[PDB]
């Protein structure tokens, strides 16, 4: 079930049992690597690097072809954002909602959604703190959120 | 549903002693209000002095005059009403006698058609009421 919604959907990807690379995929390991480097230097998150790589160049799974995850490859070279992508979009969503609430203070629904989003931010941040991805004193503040994002 | 976790013993025990206050027997036996309110003060029997002889009407379906006595207890000086449970034992009672008074039989609750009488007379003037009723011994004249 959804964490903050009364939904029980099932939409998710289903990886094939065959882990072997397709025989028609002519791109080699470092070829997939360098394409990732170009797309990341264009300013792309690992989630949308995998989308464009699976779509245009026909790679099934970056992890299957290159032996490692996209974020593992980006962090190994040293061009991955310190703020994790799933966290970054959460602060960005909260910033947009807070900005909208300032013009519309009678939008009680948006105040409710802001509480849910902020809760997801704080739960995710607590998880990253215990995994040492985030600094121990990394505090998400509603005031300095805008500078923390973008 | 009730928690069955291996480390929930604190919540299970706290919930039990919290919920135990919700039944009458545990509440009256541990709060102490019933003990204070009891004219006998937790005693099976208590002595008193017959203030006067009184008659009490029975409840609605029955029709009789139950023979009782108003008696104040020699300890703590509380005025109560005590039944005289035989055919003619009120005649044995008279003004200003020391009477042993017991509960009527269901723990501070009125019994039968007698309204609001929790007590009954066991002995009067140090001689048993059953002994006087059966003629085994007599009032000291």
């Amino acid at each position: 079930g959804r964490m903050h919604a009364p939904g029980k959907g099932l939409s998710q990807s289903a990886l094939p049992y065959r882990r072997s690379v397709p025989t028609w995929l002519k791109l080699t390991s470092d070829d997939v690597k360098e394409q990732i480097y170009k797309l990341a230097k264009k300013g792309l998150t690992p989630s949308q690097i995998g989308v464009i790589l699976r779509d245009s160049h026909g790679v099934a799974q970056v992890r299957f072809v290159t032996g490692n995850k996209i974020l593992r490859i980006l962090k190994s070279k040293g061009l991955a954002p310190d703020l994790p992508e799933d966290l970054y979009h959460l602060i960005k969503k909260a910033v947009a909602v807070r900005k909208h609430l300032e013009r519309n203070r009678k939008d009680k629904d948006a105040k409710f959604r802001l509480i849910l989003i902020e809760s997801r931010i704080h739960r995710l941040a607590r998880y990253y703190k215990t995994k040492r991805v985030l600094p121990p004193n990394w505090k998400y503040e509603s005031s300095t959120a805008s500078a923390l994002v973008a | 549903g009730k928690c069955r976790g291996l480390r929930t013993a604190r919540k299970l025990r706290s919930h039990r002693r919290d919920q135990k206050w919700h039944d009458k027997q545990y509440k009256k036996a541990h709060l102490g209000t019933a003990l204070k309110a009891n004219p006998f003060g937790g005693a099976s029997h208590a002595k008193g002095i017959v203030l006067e002889k009184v008659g009490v009407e029975a409840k609605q379906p029955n029709s009789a005059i139950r023979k009782c006595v108003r008696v104040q207890l020699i300890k703590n000086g509380k005025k109560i009403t005590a039944f005289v449970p035989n055919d003619g034992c009120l005649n044995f009672i008279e003004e200003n006698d020391e009477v042993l008074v017991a509960g009527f039989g269901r723990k501070g609750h009125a019994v039968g058609d007698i309204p609001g009488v929790r007590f009954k007379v066991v002995k009067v003037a140090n001689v048993s009421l059953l002994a006087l009723y059966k003629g085994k011994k007599e009032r000291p004249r």
Partner: protein, 129 residues
């Protein structure tokens, strides 16, 4: 959420058996589930079963033989010693003639008769009869 794969496996077996079906499919497969099925099958309360291997936690297809009355689980895995294993036998088994309590011991997952035979206690897993 799913917090006891063995509980879901045993409840699925019970429901299919009560329904009378010849086969049952358990979606999450585990080592504990497989061992539990092995001790049941050795005693004869179920038939052969297959472990369908996907790269995730696999599935299991169990051949029900129609001779399983109940295959419940005891979710809080209490510490059962040998001095109080008799109380669990009286509380759980339908009789002293048949029925089995499965408890994981340091010598492996086994029934209570075998656990007593090699003089070892452990955590109670479930029961079947």
């Amino acid at each position: 959420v799913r917090m006891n794969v063995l509980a879901d496996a045993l409840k699925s077996i019970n429901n299919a058996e009560k329904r009378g079906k010849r086969q049952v499919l358990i979606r999450p497969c585990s080592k504990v589930i497989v061992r539990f099925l092995t001790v049941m099958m050795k005693h004869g309360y179920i038939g052969e079963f297959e472990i369908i291997d996907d790269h995730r936690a696999g599935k299991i297809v169990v051949n029900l033989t129609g001779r399983l009355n109940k295959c419940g689980v005891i979710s809080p895995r209490f510490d059962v010693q040998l001095k109080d294993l008799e109380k669990w036998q009286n509380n759980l088994l339908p009789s002293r003639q048949f029925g089995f309590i499965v408890l994981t011991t340091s010598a492996g997952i086994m029934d209570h008769e075998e656990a007593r035979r090699k003089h070892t206690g452990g955590k109670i897993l479930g029961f079947f009869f």
